[PDB]
Amino acid sequence: QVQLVESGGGLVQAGGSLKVSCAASGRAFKTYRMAWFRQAPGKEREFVSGISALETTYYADSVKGRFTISRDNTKNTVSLQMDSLKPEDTAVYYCAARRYGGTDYTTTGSYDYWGQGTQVTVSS
Amino acid sequence: SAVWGISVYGVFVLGFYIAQIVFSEFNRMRLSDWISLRPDNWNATRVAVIIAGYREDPFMFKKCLESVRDSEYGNVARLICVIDGDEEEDLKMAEIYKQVYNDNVKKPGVVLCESENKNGSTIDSDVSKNICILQPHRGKRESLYTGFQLASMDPSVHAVVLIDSDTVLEKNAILEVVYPLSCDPNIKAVAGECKIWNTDTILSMLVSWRYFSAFNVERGAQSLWKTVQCVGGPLGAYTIDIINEIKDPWITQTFLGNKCTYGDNRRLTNEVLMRGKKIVYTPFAVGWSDSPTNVMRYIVQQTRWSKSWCREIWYTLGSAWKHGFSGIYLAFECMYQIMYFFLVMYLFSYIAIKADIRAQTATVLVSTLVTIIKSSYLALRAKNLKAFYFVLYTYVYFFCMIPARITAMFTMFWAKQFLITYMWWAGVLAAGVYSIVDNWYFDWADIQYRFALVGICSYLVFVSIVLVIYLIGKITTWNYTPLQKELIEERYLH
Amino acid sequence: QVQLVESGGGLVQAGGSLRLACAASGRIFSSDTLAWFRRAPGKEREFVAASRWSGGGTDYDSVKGRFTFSRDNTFNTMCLEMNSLKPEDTAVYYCALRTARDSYYYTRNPTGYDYWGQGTQ
Ligand SMILES: O=C(O)[C@H]1O[C@H](OP(=O)(O)OP(=O)(O)OC[C@H]2O[C@@H](n3ccc(=O)[nH]c3=O)[C@H](O)[C@@H]2O)[C@H](O)[C@@H](O)[C@@H]1O
Ligand SMILES: CC(C)CCC[C@@H](C)[C@H]1CC[C@H]2[C@@H]3CC=C4C[C@@H](OC(=O)CCC(=O)O)CC[C@]4(C)[C@H]3CC[C@]12C
Ligand SMILES: [Mn+2]
Numbered sequence: 227q228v229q230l231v232e233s234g235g236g237l238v239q240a241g242g243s244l245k246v247s248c249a250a251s252g253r254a255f256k257t258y259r260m261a262w263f264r265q266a267p268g269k270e271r272e273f274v275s276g277i278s279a280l281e282t283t284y285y286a287d288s289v290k291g292r293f294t295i296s297r298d299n300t301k302n303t304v305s306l307q308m309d310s311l312k313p314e315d316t317a318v319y320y321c322a323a324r325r326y327g328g329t330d331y332t333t334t335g336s337y338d339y340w341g342q343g344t345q346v347t348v349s350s
Numbered sequence: 351s352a353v354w355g356i357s358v359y360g361v362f363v364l365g366f367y368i369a370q371i372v373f374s375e376f377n378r379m380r381l382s383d384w385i386s387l388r389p390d391n392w393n394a395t396r397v398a399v400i401i402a403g404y405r406e407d408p409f410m411f412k413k414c415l416e417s418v419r420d421s422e423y424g425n426v427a428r429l430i431c432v433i434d435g436d437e438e439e440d441l442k443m444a445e446i447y448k449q450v451y452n453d454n455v456k457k458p459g460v461v462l463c464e465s466e467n468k469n470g471s472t473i474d475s476d477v478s479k480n481i482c483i484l485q486p487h488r489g490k491r492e493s494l495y496t497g498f499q500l501a502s503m504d505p506s507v508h509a510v511v512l513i514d515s516d517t518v519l520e521k522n523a524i525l526e527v528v529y530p531l532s533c534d535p536n537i538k539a540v541a542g543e544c545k546i547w548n549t550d551t552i553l554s555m556l557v558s559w560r561y562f563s564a565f566n567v568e569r570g571a572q573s574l575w576k577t578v579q580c581v582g583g584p585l586g587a588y589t590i591d592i593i594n595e596i597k598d599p600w601i602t603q604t605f606l607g608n609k610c611t612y613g614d615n616r617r618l619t620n621e622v623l624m625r626g627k628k629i630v631y632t633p634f635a636v637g638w639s640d641s642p643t644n645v646m647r648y649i650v651q652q653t654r655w656s657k658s659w660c661r662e663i664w665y666t667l668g669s670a671w672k673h674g675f676s677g678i679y680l681a682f683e684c685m686y687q688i689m690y691f692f693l694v695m696y697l698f699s700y701i702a703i704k705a706d707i708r709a710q711t712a713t714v715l716v717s718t719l720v721t722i723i724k725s726s727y728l729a730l731r732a733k734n735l736k737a738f739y740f741v742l743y744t745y746v747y748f749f750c751m752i753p754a755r756i757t758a759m760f761t762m763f764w765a766k767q768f769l770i771t772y773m774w775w776a777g778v779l780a781a782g783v784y785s786i787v788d789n790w791y792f793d794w795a796d797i798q799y800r801f802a803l804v805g806i807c808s809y810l811v812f813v814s815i816v817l818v819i820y821l822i823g824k825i826t827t828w829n830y831t832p833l834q835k836e837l838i839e840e841r842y843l844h
Numbered sequence: 845q846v847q848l849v850e851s852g853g854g855l856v857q858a859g860g861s862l863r864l865a866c867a868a869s870g871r872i873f874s875s876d877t878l879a880w881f882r883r884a885p886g887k888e889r890e891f892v893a894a895s896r897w898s899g900g901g902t903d904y905d906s907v908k909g910r911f912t913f914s915r916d917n918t919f920n921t922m923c924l925e926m927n928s929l930k931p932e933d934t935a936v937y938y939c940a941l942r943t944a945r946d947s948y949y950y951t952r953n954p955t956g957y958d959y960w961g962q963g964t965q
Contacts, residue, residue: 257791278796331795420873422898426948452946478947
């Protein structure tokens with residue numbers, strides 16, 4: 227059992243960072259693969275980023291040069307950094323975790339634990 | 351990070367092995383020319399075979415004397431046999447000799463070492479006779495000093511061939527072990543291949559291949575520079591010109607005070623190498639011996655051998671001054687023998703404390719590949735195809751020689767020597783449990799996780815099929831040495 | 845123990861060719877000296893030729909270059925080939941074994957051989 231709490235949101239001009247930070251309380255956070263999803267007003271939370279327990283990083287399309295991911299195992303957190311934001315990114319951001327999983331890391335049906343909400347709006 | 355420590359370990363272990371392989375090949379090519387430039391009917395050195403023993407398997411003590419009597423060599427002067435201890439238990443060790451050679455079973459009242467007059471006439475005025483001495487026992491040192499004294503007073507004896515009681519020399523063993531003493535004037539001792547005939551146990555076969563890889567490679571590389579660090583325990587030929595001089599400081603030794611006697615062979619070789627002389631090793635001097643089977647007995651044997659090594663590798667290092675340029679090898683070999691064990695310990699500690707699947711599967715695979723290469727060379731040299739059992743020698747090493755090394759280091763200053771071994775086993779088990787319960791997750795989408803799991807599964811499958819091959823071979827009686835296949839027949843009828 | 849049985853010999857005239865075999869029952873140990881001893885009519889045993897079972901060759905005077913040894917070492921038998929026989933070369937031949945037990949010293953004395961065969965011719 228791991229509790230996920232996410233933070234970081236607000237108005238920001240196109241070209242800001244507005245790093246998001248999701249922390250996790252659990253027995254051993256370093257074995258949990260983590261992922262970041264983008265709940266848009268539509269399209270039902272497209273996959274955005276992820277990183278396994280062995281630091282390997284997976285990124286969605288057209289976000290390769292804009293999103294950066296990492297982990298903090300001392301203070302359990304993910305701390306997703308952002309660069310060169312766009313008005314198309316105005317959406318909630320969600321934090322998901324996994325311990326036992328298969329080869330389908332891009333679907334919400336695989337991850338077991340879930341966060342609450344990281345709404346972010348980008349101005350013109 | 352782990353690359354400096356995995357790749358450097360692989361290179362450190364494999365480069366020296368390749369160097370030793372090429373040096374052994376050079377030595378074999380050197381000895382073949384000597385053997386070729388030799389008349390067929392060659393008798394020049396009058397040897398005197400020396401046997402020392404203590405309750406050594408009445409049948410096998412028969413096989414040893416029979417092999418020495420069946421050995422082909424024109425010029426054998428006599429046979430000096432010394433039997434430790436006098437009791438109605440060693441009388442039925444003199445009798446097995448008396449039924450092979452003659453009735454000259456003497457019994458000097460005092461040990462020729464503690465006796466004042468160290469010279470001959472130990473109830474022995476007969477030089478043209480085959481003698482057997484029954485004396486009070488004080489170790490192989492005291493029972494071999496008697497033999498050295500016996501086969502010295504004859505001015506027509508110029509070399510002495512030492513054997514152990516449970517050995518079965520081939521016919522052309524003495525002939526090919528005494529020749530290098532006549533090949534060069536700076537050679538005062540020759541080693542000899544000491545094969546193992548008992549390979550009906552899993553511990554008795556990997557150690558057999560360890561004996562092969564520690565003689566025909568390790569002790570062959572040193573002979574190229576004529577600085578063999580330890581003559582063969584069971585089989586070995588010594589020049590009387592050096593025995594007559596080194597017998598006095600050999601059995602006088604004090605290390606730190608209290609005088610104790612173990613690892614006498616390496617002491618003889620060390621005293622030969624501390625006088626600036628050269629020692630070579632010939633692979634055409636095959637001799638057979640048995641091996642310990644119980645794990646505890648093997649650990650005890652290896653802790654005695656490690657005790658012997660830890661006090662005289664210092665002297666082998668310090669005597670490299672006497673030897674010339676060839677002799678930097680004598681320092682490099684000792685430095686390697688130290689830092690390799692230290693590096694293995696450090697590697698285990700690192701990959702057991704900093705748990706990482708990709709930093710453990712990689713080490714396991716690299717170690718397995720290196721051992722496979724070594725076993726492949728052993729198979730090519732021996733033309734045996736049973737040498738691929740050497741892949742499992744790593745387990746025997748890690749679980750028996752390392753506790754022996756730690757115990758010898760601790761005693762250098764049940765619970766006497768087995769507590770450290772039990773603690774080491776418990777520590778390895780605790781490290782394994784911690785590693786397996788720490789990384790308790792399954793992530794098939796991760797390529798690194800897939801590589802780690804696939805590697806560990808393939809290694810487990812490889813070990814399992816090797817063990818199954820061994821079991822099948824034991825079932826069909828395929829591991830049995832051709833010698834053992836005949837001793838097990840001569841044992842039934844007797 | 846080791847029983848030696850020798851065969852051969854017969855009519856001898858002028859320079860003849862003969863071949864005497866000696867078969868051994870037991871173990872010879874490749875360190876024991878096997879020799880051919882000669883006993884002339886009404887005369888003491890004489891020596892003809894010895895050989896170690898490991899392949900050492902020796903002979904005696906008045907027969908060197910005339911007789912030759914050959915140990916099979918596989919059939920547990922020896923064969924002595926005789927060339928250019930003499931009328932004075934009439935006697936009974938024994939094959940004897942000397943064990944290198946008390947000593948590895950090669951001796952020509954007939955009393956140093958433990959086991960003896962049976963005379964032929
Ligand atoms: O370090 C040693 O002394 C020997 O120990 C073992 O010898 P092994 O014959 O395999 O085993 P054990 O049953 O311990 O016999 C030790 C040998 O040392 C000698 N010994 C030992 C003990 C004793 O009281 N008296 C004695 O003469 C005998 O030759 C005996 O064969 C090793 O196998 C040999 O390589 C080594 O040379
Ligand atoms: C918790 C369960 C799984 C039982 C515990 C067993 C493992 C923790 C042990 C069994 C085999 C061991 C390995 C066996 C051999 C080696 C070789 C060793 O390197 C060598 O000693 C090779 C040197 C040479 O080739 O001579 C490094 C540790 C390692 C990987 C050992 C690490 C610990 C292992 C995996
Ligand atoms: Mn024994």
